[PDB]
């Protein structure tokens, strides 16, 4: 009664028989905005089931050389579903997330992925190598949306910070000999009650292979990693026309 689990939101149900418990970011369940924490005076929308549900956004292929990937969040779910709509139509957005990363293999494969949530995940550049040039990461790199983006210098998380310490963040590991999925529930984290789903990404999801994938030849070589996630307590306000970015 701990390695098996079932997550159900809206009209979606995830199943798993080799889980490793559930992490609750900074020990706090997603909640709605207090009546004294808020400022925006207009009465918000809380679509509920039409937005708070599981969206299986993408699949990556784990290879013996993979460096690791990341997805910025608020963003990732735009353009997709009714959630995406309320996000374009409304100025203000607020919500928590249930992130379920899955990846399975056989008892004969081996490897370990680090799945973490890094709030305010600001990306950096190599500064032109020499570090004299003040370059800046493009809209394509900072906000890749679904499809995510691959890291180029995971050791420093492409931001000059040691990944070795990334675990001070709500994380969980996917060690093939042990489990086949990570589940992290993240509460709304920002210095404001609401913010724009468009120009601000409350956090990023990192999926990095710390112990490389390996297996003797002949075993299925296609080990995918799929990202499924669900907004929780989504609230929107500041209605206007639909804006893309």
């Amino acid at each position: 009664s701990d390695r098996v689990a079932q997550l159900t939101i809206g009209n979606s149900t995830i199943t798993t028989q080799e889980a490793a418990n559930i992490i609750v970011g900074y020990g706090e369940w997603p909640s709605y905005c207090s009546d004294d924490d808020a400022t925006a005076v207009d009465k918000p929308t809380r679509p509920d089931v039409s937005v708070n549900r599981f969206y299986t956004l993408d699949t990556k292929l784990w290879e013996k050389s993979s460096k690791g990937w990341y997805w910025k969040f608020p963003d990732v779910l735009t353009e997709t579903g009714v959630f995406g709509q309320n996000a374009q139509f409304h100025y203000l957005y607020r919500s928590g997330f249930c992130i379920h990363v899955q990846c399975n293999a056989s008892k004969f494969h081996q490897g370990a992925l680090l799945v973490a949530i890094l709030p305010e995940y600001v990306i950096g550049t190599v500064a032109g190598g020499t570090g004299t040039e003040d370059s800046h990461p493009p809209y394509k790199q900072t906000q890749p949306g679904a499809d995510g983006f691959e890291l180029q210098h995971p050791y420093v998380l492409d931001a000059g910070i040691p990944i070795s310490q990334l675990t001070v963040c709500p994380h969980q590991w996917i060690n093939l000999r042990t489990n086949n999925c990570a589940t992290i529930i993240v509460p709304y984290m920002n210095t404001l009650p609401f913010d724009s789903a468009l120009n601000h990404c409350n956090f990023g999801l990192l999926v990095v292979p710390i112990s490389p994938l390996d297996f003797d030849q002949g075993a299925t070589p296609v080990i995918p990693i799929t990202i499924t996630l669900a907004p929780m307590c989504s609230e929107f306000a500041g209605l206007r026309q639909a804006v893309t970015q």
Partner: protein
Amino acid sequence: DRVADVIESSIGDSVSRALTQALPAPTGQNTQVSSHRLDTGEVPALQAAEIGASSNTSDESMIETRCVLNSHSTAETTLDSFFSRAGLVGEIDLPLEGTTNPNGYANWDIDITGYAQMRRKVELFTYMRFDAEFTFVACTPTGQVVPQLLQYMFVPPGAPKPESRESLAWQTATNPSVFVKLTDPPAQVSVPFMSPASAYQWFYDGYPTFGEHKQEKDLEYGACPNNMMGTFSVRNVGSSKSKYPLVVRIYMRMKHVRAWIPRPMRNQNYLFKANPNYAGNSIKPTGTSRTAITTL
């Protein structure tokens, strides 16, 4: 009368579930007597890091321990203890001959990300709320004290930024200014937590404008206005050449600190302010290195 699913519908629960509680911890935890344990079914030592939680194994479960009454204080590890230490965050030059700041006045954009020591400490957290004590140490480049009168002026964003030593803005009718001689002890003043956000943000993963976000504008990524507190202007009070080359060092001591969401400590040399850029060709290891894992 209602539809039920509306009556239960927990939508609109403003309070967070919690799951953890803050307990008193004035001293380090004491060690209690432990004895041998030879049994099945109970394995403290065994853990599953995958879960994402730190090993809760106690010393008592790994060895027969004595009893120790730990009375070591944990006071010096509080945020206030750790942060309420004045540190250099700004430096302003007011030379006689030069290209930097002649004319006799300067405008320092209030940004503490300019110096490595202080910057790294704060970049330990994602959000920080606090008041501060700013102290201004002025003198000549030789470190000599000179009979010169200065005027420091905090210029909130939106206020007229002085364009010359004799700018009308120095009337400082509503801005807070300070007049000090370099012969008087360094000026010190108390600043509150100004900012429309509930906390200053060391890292802002996003943009502030809502536009096209083309190449040229990638300069604005990570730029969060809730952190731009305005500028700090200084001038030698008068209408003629200073007569002495000056320098002002700005020290900041945080107080009444609250911090949130710890992050990994800075790994690579810093390159620019409000921009985590690192040197791609000089990516060094977090620390020292050996020759083999089987040798010290």
